[PDB]
Amino acid sequence: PVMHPHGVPPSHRPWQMKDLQAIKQEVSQAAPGSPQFMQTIRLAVQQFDPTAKDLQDLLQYLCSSLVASLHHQQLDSLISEAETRGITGYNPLAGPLRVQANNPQQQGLRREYQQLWLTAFAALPGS
């Protein structure tokens, strides 16, 4: 998660088990990508403002190995398409995209990465 308190520099902190547990229990048996699943995960992304790495960890914790593999493939395609368009806050001469999306200071890029990560669930059967 990225902590961005008012008027102080942002910083990354690791996921805490109690936070992950609450997300998993709220999702319960809702199919990945379903309206109930997305309603919960959208709120989790807002509350914890996760980096790209944090989102990989959340996907791995919440979903089966199969769903995670499908999501990985879909998001990789969406990222390639987004790079062709240009992405808010992404400088192609700086770090790898996913490194930049782990930089707490690059909030605009992280938020756009979050949107792509959420959108990748739409490719799954279920919804």
Numbering used by the authors: 1 to 127
Original authors' sentences:
Human T-cell Leukaemia Virus type 1 (HTLV-1) is an untreatable retrovirus that causes lethal malignancies and degenerative inflammatory conditions. Here, we show that high-resolution crystal structures of the mature-length HTLV-1c CA protein define essential lattice interfaces and identify a distinct ligand-binding pocket. Across the known Orthoretrovirinae, CA is a two-domain protein with HIV being the best characterised. However, our structures reveal that HTLV-1 does still have a pocket formed between helices 3, 4, and 5, albeit an electropositive one capable of binding to either phosphate or sulfate in vitro.
During screening, a third crystal form of HTLV-1 CANTD was observed diffracting to 1.47 Å resolution in space group P212121 with two molecules in the asymmetric unit. In this case, the crystallant included 0.2 M ammonium sulfate. In one of the HTLV-1 CANTD molecules, a sulfate ion is unambiguously resolved bound to an electropositive pocket on the NTD surface formed by α-helices 3, 4, 5 and 7. The sulfate ion is coordinated by residues H71, H72, R98, and W117. The sidechains of Q56, H72 and R98 appear to act as gatekeepers that flip up and down to allow the sulfate entry into the pocket. Mutants that would remove a direct interaction with the sulfate or phosphate groups (H71A, H72A, R98A and W117A) all effectively abolished infectivity with a concomitant loss of particle production. As the equivalent site has been exploited for the development of arguably the most potent and longest-acting anti-HIV drug, our structural and phenotype data suggest that similar attention should be paid to this site in HTLV-1 with a view to the development of capsid-targeting pre-exposure prophylactics.
